[PDB]
Amino acid sequence: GTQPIDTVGFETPMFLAMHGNFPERIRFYVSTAGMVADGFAVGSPAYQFATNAFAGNFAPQRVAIGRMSIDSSKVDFTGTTNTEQVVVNITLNKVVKAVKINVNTPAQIATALADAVTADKATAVATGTYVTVTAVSPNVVSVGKGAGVYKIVNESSETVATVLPSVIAENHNWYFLATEARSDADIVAAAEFAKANYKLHIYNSTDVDAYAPENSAASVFDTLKSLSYDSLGTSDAGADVDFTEGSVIGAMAANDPSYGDSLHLKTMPGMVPFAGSDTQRSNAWSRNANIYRGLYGGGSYIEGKTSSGQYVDVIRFSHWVKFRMEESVFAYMKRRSDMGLSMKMSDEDLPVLKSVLMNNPINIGIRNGGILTGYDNKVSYDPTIIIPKRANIPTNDLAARILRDVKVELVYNNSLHYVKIRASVVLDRPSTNAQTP
Amino acid sequence: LTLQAYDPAKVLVFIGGQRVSGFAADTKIVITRNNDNISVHAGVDGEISNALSRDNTGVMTLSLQNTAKWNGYLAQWQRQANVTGLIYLPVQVEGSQGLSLNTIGWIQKQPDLSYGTEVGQMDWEIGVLDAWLSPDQIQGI
Amino acid sequence: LTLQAYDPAKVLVFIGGQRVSGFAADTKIVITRNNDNISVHAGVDGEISNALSRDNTGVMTLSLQNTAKWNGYLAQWQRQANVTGLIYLPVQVEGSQGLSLNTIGWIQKQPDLSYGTEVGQMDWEIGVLDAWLSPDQIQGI
Amino acid sequence: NQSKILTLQAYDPAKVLVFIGGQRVSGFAADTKIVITRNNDNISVHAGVDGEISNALSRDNTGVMTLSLQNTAKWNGYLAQWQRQANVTGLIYLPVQVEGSQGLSLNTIGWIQKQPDLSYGTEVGQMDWEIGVLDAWLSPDQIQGIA
Amino acid sequence: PLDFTNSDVVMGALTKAVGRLCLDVTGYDVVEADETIPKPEGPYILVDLSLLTPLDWATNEVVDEDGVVHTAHNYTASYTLTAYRGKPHWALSRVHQAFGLPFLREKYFPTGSPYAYSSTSNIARMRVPLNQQMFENRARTIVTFNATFVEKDLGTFEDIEHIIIGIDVDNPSGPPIGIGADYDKGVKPGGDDPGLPPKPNPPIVYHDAIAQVCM
Amino acid sequence: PLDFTNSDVVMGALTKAVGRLCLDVTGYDVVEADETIPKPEGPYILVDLSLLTPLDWATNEVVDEDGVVHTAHNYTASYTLTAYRGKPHWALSRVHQAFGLPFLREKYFPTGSPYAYSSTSNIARMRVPLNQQMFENRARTIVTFNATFVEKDLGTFEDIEHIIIGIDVDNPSGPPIGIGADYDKGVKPGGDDPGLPPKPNPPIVYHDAIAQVCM
């Protein structure tokens, strides 16, 4: 029973964070200041994602944040090295704090972090490589990144495959999908929900099996490849601490698919250039794990392919056409019914759908260049609309008051990615038919 | 297999989304183009070269009885556009058996209104921004 | 709910405040504009741009029997204005079912007067300073 | 073709505003309202015997602006007074501005360069006032999307 | 509930309208052709609906509340008048001029009525022998009226409650992508989402400076 | 196997289409001119196919699978309607307006049908004496319809299986060179020669450089 989104929703991205800062299941913001007011700690996951999303060239106007019941955080130094003042930002019930640990080994740093016991409500529990922070029933705690080399991890009693059906029921006016959980089960559940609700799933992973040799691997990229979904995946080193899905979305949220524009070379502020070697790049390209290569002193995305090998822009264009046609038909049918002139099921009224559909969804694409037109061979690329006649409508469909088998056809006008040249240098230059072929 | 007979009552005109009604007797509409398809340049010795026409506007006449309710709508649309600057509306035509048409267009000139002893007629001039006829409705093309 | 029938006798013309009377048979009046609504400039490659018309004058013909008492009034008004320089008078038209009109205007040219064996006709040319028709009297617009 | 409509809103000539000295001009002629021209081309080319080419940048950017008004217009009076004002007192300059409804604008200072030819006949005449503009760089500011 | 006046009502009332105006102007007595009676005494007029002409294409369509359609057509009805004694030619002429008198028309042809007067034909005076002894004076004319007839349809078609559209986007990177679109009567595309926040109207406050600049 | 509906079917079905619409609108009873019966009781309508006009040159040709040809011609059939009692002029008028009602037409004149309505003539009301006692009310009108008639040929010509062409090339170096050319139904000019090798599509591979130049 998927209800349709509208134009504003087509740009709104949703991030499924863990927190308890508001009672609702979802809220919308137009800047990080509102989230700060709601008690999100600077450097917290949702804050980072919102900053990245607003920091893009094609940034969206509003960002939606979901809620998943939080249980307890973690400040993990395991496997890290630190020779700098470690700092952690903590917000407690609208009270904002800062924590400082000087300089030494990660275990010593973690133990010394237990000093976060003053002016508190909340509790801190060191464990030799990480500190587990747990709040108390009435207290609310937000823990955010600072200057230290550490990653913040959250845990919850819920699961995505059960939280999402609540968020969508609460509100459905959003298109992109993202999550904080990074387990394979959570990622696959998100992909399966998104593919069923016609939403684009995005995710960043740091697993080295993306680099692993093509001969064999068992990474989430490979699982999605096998299942043949459309989730857009990318491999980044800093994903687990920066949630760069926001940066990815910020480079594609605002440009409409009517231009047929792709994602091949767009700069994404906040991302960190890929570091592996050319063999690793070749390996990754096989799994459809897009990378952010740094070239000629700048950063550039690479080829934006989905899990099943298809390009992202074709999928997005098809979805845009779907939503635009839905909206246009609803608008026209509602205007017709505002007057006492409702559209009847007769041959004197049915054809008008041709112009109604030509106007809003299709003609804009033909104008802007996303739809190919012209002549091929013995075929033409012009979009076509076919509508049935009253004689062909089944009596059961007449009784149910439903119209079926309205068909449309188009051609997509893809963009260019690669170029090859055959230059030649010579010290000099060397049949004369001169007859028209 | 029964071949169609030309049904004058199934010739439809949709302007802006609605269907026009209230035509005068005889010709309901007339469609005419403005320019020739190809321009031929002929040399002194007989060499011939052709140029393709890139101006495809047309004109469609619309005969309505002066008591038709659709005169008011066109009069309102005409004056509205002269102020706002938005002049285009979708135009679509159908044929019982004939050549259809589906483009955008605008009201070009105000017809001539005359009053007498019998219900008269008004002939509107609707400009159409493309004038290519289509074989959609031909039974067998 | 009874729909109107076109009543030729309720087509009214008010010039200067009074009502005209004494028309000749057939067409009592005719209203025609002078210029096209929009001017279209078409480029070499097919780009199209439009311009809005800012000259909206029209012309209204008025058929009167040469024995009508209203010929004298128009003849007097015409000569008076040629001397004083005051040429404008209000003009208003109504339709039993049709498009009205309400502007100012002036007598443009002197008609042609001919004498014979039967009561003739004179067709005055009244310029109207705006020619937008109105749906006021349409029953349902 | 409808995919190449160069103007989605009809070009209404009445949107073109002209302000001289801070008052809006009115009472224009039949066909053309204004014309803006330069006097000197942008750069000078000095080509040598063997093909050496070098270019220079101009520093005279003055232009001329023509303003067509019906000879029965009231604004003829304001310009006629202004001429004598400047001839005696020596204050010639006056701000000038133009609004490019769907084109190029202009905003500079100018002065009355010459007075037109006044003619009386059987039809209402016309006047072509020349408002020399000190600097004549057209501005695209009215156009959106200029990156 | 959206009722009207069909053709039968208009057509029958037009005769009586002509009948009353003839009686009220000429002072003669009136009779129709519908049923025959022994010839009255004194001058009198005979009314007949000789002919009726249709106009091909309907001028208006009125849709009932439930969807039924009422169509309106223009017509022209011609009545043949005959005056049988006295000065018949004088009698008919006064009927003609009656249509030019404003107050008299308003009684029987009020503004908005479904019929109107159009024109008149030549009035011919005739002498007819009777019993081979006497010549009787008579006259004849044809008066043409305008009219408008309305009729009601016999049903309606079903409404469009649900629309299903199939879409196929041909592309070169793979096989065509199939995707569908749907519409439902009460399902808004955006649900009831509040949308973006509006730009607030600032409250009305006092200002000291006519024009203030602050950096 | 490629069958159709010849003229006889269309012509006979057009009468019944008119008959049902007259019955379903006016409420009167209907009768044709084909066979005579004692005059019915109550108001009724009489239908007659007075005239039929052809259009000279065929508009379409449909070729059977085996080559037989079916030709289609446009026509125009005129029907004379007469209503005999009650208010006949009212009855005929409602028939005229019926063709403007959408739902009512669809029952009997569905889209794609081989006949359609064109126009109507003036409706004349008449009074006819009977037995020298009474005047009977009547009316008359002519309704013009469009139609299309299809007929099937009586055979076909033989196909062209073999073509022989003689060629003579006059030249100055000697006598004209005679040479022949031939065609056969299944003999391709080139047999089944594969032709030149095609230009291969390179396989899809990974590229490190966006734009690479190699000498």
Coordinates of N, CA, C and O in Angstrom, one line a residue, chain A residues 64-149:
Chain A
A64 N 15.5 15.1 7.0 CA 14.6 14.4 7.9 C 15.5 13.5 8.7 O 16.4 12.8 8.2
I65 N 15.2 13.4 10.0 CA 16.0 12.5 10.9 C 15.0 11.6 11.6 O 14.0 12.0 12.2
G66 N 15.3 10.3 11.5 CA 14.5 9.3 12.2 C 15.0 9.0 13.6 O 16.1 9.4 14.0
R67 N 14.2 8.2 14.4 CA 14.6 7.9 15.8 C 14.6 6.4 15.9 O 13.6 5.7 15.6
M68 N 15.6 5.8 16.5 CA 15.7 4.5 17.0 C 16.1 4.5 18.4 O 17.1 5.1 18.8
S69 N 15.4 3.7 19.3 CA 15.6 3.8 20.7 C 17.1 3.5 21.0 O 17.6 2.5 20.7
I70 N 17.7 4.5 21.7 CA 19.1 4.4 22.1 C 19.2 3.7 23.4 O 18.3 3.9 24.3
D71 N 20.2 2.9 23.6 CA 20.5 2.2 24.9 C 21.7 2.7 25.6 O 21.7 3.1 26.8
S72 N 22.9 2.6 24.9 CA 24.1 3.1 25.5 C 25.1 3.3 24.4 O 25.2 2.6 23.4
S73 N 26.0 4.3 24.6 CA 27.0 4.7 23.7 C 28.3 3.9 23.9 O 28.4 3.1 24.9
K74 N 29.3 4.2 23.1 CA 30.7 3.7 23.3 C 31.7 4.8 22.8 O 31.5 5.4 21.7
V75 N 32.7 5.0 23.5 CA 33.8 5.8 23.1 C 35.0 4.9 23.0 O 35.7 4.5 24.0
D76 N 35.3 4.4 21.7 CA 36.3 3.3 21.5 C 37.6 3.9 21.0 O 37.6 4.7 20.1
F77 N 38.7 3.5 21.7 CA 40.0 3.8 21.3 C 40.7 2.6 20.8 O 41.9 2.7 20.5
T78 N 40.1 1.4 20.8 CA 40.7 0.2 20.5 C 41.4 0.2 19.1 O 40.7 0.7 18.1
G79 N 42.6 -0.1 19.0 CA 43.4 -0.1 17.8 C 43.8 1.2 17.3 O 44.4 1.3 16.2
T80 N 43.7 2.3 18.2 CA 44.0 3.6 17.8 C 45.4 4.0 18.3 O 46.0 3.3 19.1
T81 N 45.9 5.1 17.8 CA 47.2 5.7 18.3 C 46.9 7.2 18.5 O 46.4 7.8 17.7
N82 N 47.3 7.7 19.7 CA 47.1 9.1 20.0 C 48.3 9.7 20.6 O 48.9 9.2 21.5
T83 N 48.6 10.9 20.1 CA 49.7 11.8 20.7 C 49.2 13.2 20.7 O 50.0 14.1 20.5
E84 N 47.9 13.4 21.0 CA 47.3 14.7 21.0 C 46.2 14.8 22.1 O 45.7 13.7 22.5
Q85 N 45.9 16.0 22.5 CA 44.8 16.1 23.5 C 43.5 15.5 23.0 O 43.0 16.0 22.0
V86 N 43.1 14.5 23.6 CA 41.8 13.9 23.3 C 40.7 14.7 23.9 O 40.7 15.2 25.0
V87 N 39.6 15.0 23.1 CA 38.5 15.8 23.5 C 37.2 15.1 23.1 O 37.1 14.5 22.0
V88 N 36.2 15.2 24.0 CA 34.9 14.6 23.7 C 33.9 15.7 24.1 O 33.9 16.3 25.2
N89 N 32.9 15.9 23.2 CA 31.8 16.8 23.4 C 30.6 16.0 24.0 O 30.2 15.0 23.4
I90 N 30.0 16.4 25.1 CA 28.9 15.8 25.7 C 27.8 16.8 26.0 O 28.1 17.9 26.6
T91 N 26.6 16.5 25.6 CA 25.4 17.4 26.0 C 24.5 16.6 26.9 O 24.1 15.4 26.5
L92 N 24.2 17.1 28.0 CA 23.3 16.5 29.0 C 22.1 17.3 29.3 O 22.2 18.4 29.9
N93 N 20.9 16.9 28.8 CA 19.7 17.5 29.1 C 19.7 19.0 28.9 O 19.4 19.8 29.7
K94 N 20.2 19.4 27.7 CA 20.3 20.8 27.3 C 21.5 21.5 27.9 O 21.8 22.6 27.7
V95 N 22.3 20.7 28.8 CA 23.5 21.2 29.3 C 24.7 20.7 28.5 O 24.8 19.5 28.2
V96 N 25.5 21.6 28.0 CA 26.6 21.3 27.1 C 27.9 21.3 27.9 O 28.2 22.2 28.7
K97 N 28.7 20.2 27.7 CA 30.0 20.1 28.4 C 31.1 19.8 27.4 O 30.9 19.6 26.2
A98 N 32.3 19.7 27.9 CA 33.5 19.3 27.2 C 34.4 18.5 28.1 O 34.4 18.7 29.3
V99 N 35.1 17.5 27.5 CA 35.9 16.6 28.3 C 37.3 16.6 27.7 O 37.5 16.7 26.4
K100 N 38.4 16.5 28.5 CA 39.7 16.6 28.1 C 40.6 15.6 28.7 O 40.5 15.4 29.9
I101 N 41.4 14.9 27.9 CA 42.3 13.9 28.3 C 43.6 14.2 27.6 O 43.7 14.3 26.4
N102 N 44.7 14.3 28.4 CA 46.0 14.8 27.8 C 46.8 13.6 27.3 O 46.9 12.5 27.9
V103 N 47.6 13.9 26.2 CA 48.5 12.9 25.7 C 47.7 11.7 25.2 O 48.0 11.0 24.2
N104 N 52.4 7.6 26.2 CA 51.0 7.3 26.5 C 50.4 6.2 25.6 O 50.9 6.0 24.5
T105 N 49.4 5.6 26.0 CA 48.8 4.4 25.3 C 47.3 4.6 25.3 O 46.7 5.2 26.2
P106 N 46.7 4.0 24.3 CA 45.2 4.0 24.2 C 44.5 3.5 25.5 O 43.5 4.0 25.9
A107 N 45.0 2.4 26.1 CA 44.4 1.9 27.3 C 44.5 2.9 28.4 O 43.5 3.1 29.1
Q108 N 45.7 3.5 28.6 CA 45.8 4.6 29.6 C 44.8 5.7 29.3 O 44.2 6.2 30.3
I109 N 44.7 6.1 28.1 CA 43.8 7.2 27.7 C 42.3 6.8 28.1 O 41.6 7.6 28.7
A110 N 41.9 5.6 27.7 CA 40.6 5.1 28.0 C 40.3 5.1 29.5 O 39.3 5.5 30.0
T111 N 41.3 4.6 30.3 CA 41.2 4.6 31.7 C 41.0 6.0 32.3 O 40.2 6.3 33.1
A112 N 41.9 6.9 31.8 CA 41.8 8.3 32.3 C 40.5 9.0 31.9 O 40.1 9.9 32.6
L113 N 39.9 8.5 30.9 CA 38.6 9.1 30.5 C 37.5 8.9 31.5 O 36.5 9.6 31.5
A114 N 37.7 7.9 32.4 CA 36.7 7.7 33.5 C 36.5 9.0 34.3 O 35.6 9.0 35.1
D115 N 37.4 10.0 34.2 CA 37.2 11.2 35.0 C 35.9 11.9 34.6 O 35.5 12.8 35.3
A116 N 35.2 11.5 33.5 CA 33.9 12.0 33.2 C 32.9 11.5 34.2 O 32.0 10.7 33.8
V117 N 33.0 11.8 35.5 CA 32.1 11.4 36.5 C 31.6 12.6 37.3 O 30.7 12.5 38.1
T118 N 32.2 13.8 37.0 CA 31.8 15.0 37.7 C 30.6 15.6 37.0 O 30.3 15.4 35.9
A119 N 29.8 16.3 37.8 CA 28.6 17.0 37.3 C 27.6 16.0 36.7 O 27.0 16.3 35.7
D120 N 27.5 14.8 37.3 CA 26.7 13.8 36.8 C 26.5 12.7 37.9 O 27.1 12.7 38.9
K121 N 23.5 11.8 37.5 CA 22.8 11.6 36.3 C 23.4 10.5 35.4 O 23.1 9.3 35.7
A122 N 24.1 10.8 34.4 CA 24.7 9.8 33.5 C 25.9 9.2 34.2 O 26.5 9.7 35.1
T123 N 26.3 8.1 33.6 CA 27.4 7.3 34.2 C 28.4 7.0 33.1 O 28.1 6.9 31.9
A124 N 29.7 6.7 33.4 CA 30.7 6.3 32.5 C 31.4 5.1 33.1 O 31.7 5.0 34.3
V125 N 31.7 4.2 32.2 CA 32.3 2.9 32.6 C 33.5 2.5 31.7 O 33.2 2.1 30.5
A126 N 34.7 2.7 32.1 CA 35.8 2.3 31.3 C 36.0 0.8 31.3 O 35.6 0.1 32.2
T127 N 36.6 0.3 30.2 CA 36.9 -1.1 30.0 C 38.3 -1.4 29.5 O 38.5 -2.5 28.9
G128 N 39.2 -0.4 29.5 CA 40.6 -0.7 29.1 C 40.9 -0.3 27.6 O 42.0 0.0 27.3
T129 N 39.9 -0.3 26.8 CA 40.0 0.2 25.4 C 38.9 1.1 25.0 O 39.0 1.7 23.9
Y130 N 37.8 1.1 25.7 CA 36.6 1.9 25.3 C 35.9 2.2 26.6 O 35.9 1.5 27.6
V131 N 35.1 3.3 26.6 CA 34.3 3.7 27.7 C 32.8 3.6 27.3 O 32.4 4.2 26.3
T132 N 32.0 2.9 28.1 CA 30.6 2.8 27.9 C 29.8 3.8 28.7 O 29.9 3.8 29.9
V133 N 29.1 4.6 28.0 CA 28.3 5.7 28.6 C 26.9 5.3 28.6 O 26.3 5.0 27.5
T134 N 26.2 5.3 29.7 CA 24.8 4.9 29.9 C 24.1 6.0 30.7 O 24.6 6.4 31.8
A135 N 23.0 6.5 30.2 CA 22.2 7.5 30.9 C 21.2 6.8 31.8 O 21.1 5.6 31.9
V136 N 20.5 7.6 32.6 CA 19.4 7.2 33.5 C 18.1 7.6 33.0 O 18.0 8.5 32.2
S137 N 17.0 6.9 33.4 CA 15.7 7.1 32.9 C 15.3 8.5 32.5 O 15.0 8.7 31.3
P138 N 15.4 9.5 33.4 CA 15.0 10.9 33.0 C 16.1 11.6 32.2 O 15.8 12.7 31.7
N139 N 17.4 11.2 32.3 CA 18.4 11.9 31.6 C 18.5 11.6 30.1 O 18.2 10.5 29.7
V140 N 19.0 12.6 29.4 CA 19.3 12.5 28.0 C 20.7 12.9 27.8 O 21.2 13.9 28.3
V141 N 21.4 12.1 27.0 CA 22.9 12.3 26.8 C 23.2 12.2 25.3 O 22.7 11.3 24.6
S142 N 24.0 13.1 24.8 CA 24.5 13.1 23.4 C 26.0 13.2 23.5 O 26.5 14.1 24.1
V143 N 26.7 12.3 22.8 CA 28.1 12.2 22.8 C 28.6 12.4 21.4 O 28.2 11.8 20.5
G144 N 29.5 13.4 21.2 CA 30.0 13.8 19.9 C 31.5 13.8 19.8 O 32.2 13.8 20.7
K145 N 31.9 13.7 18.5 CA 33.3 13.7 18.2 C 34.0 15.0 18.6 O 33.4 16.0 18.6
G146 N 35.3 14.8 18.9 CA 36.2 15.9 19.2 C 37.5 15.9 18.4 O 37.5 15.5 17.3
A147 N 38.6 16.3 19.0 CA 39.9 16.3 18.4 C 40.6 15.0 18.5 O 41.6 14.8 17.8
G148 N 40.1 14.0 19.2 CA 40.8 12.8 19.4 C 40.6 11.8 18.3 O 39.7 12.0 17.4
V149 N 41.4 10.8 18.2 CA 41.4 9.7 17.2 C 40.6 8.6 17.8 O 41.1 7.7 18.5

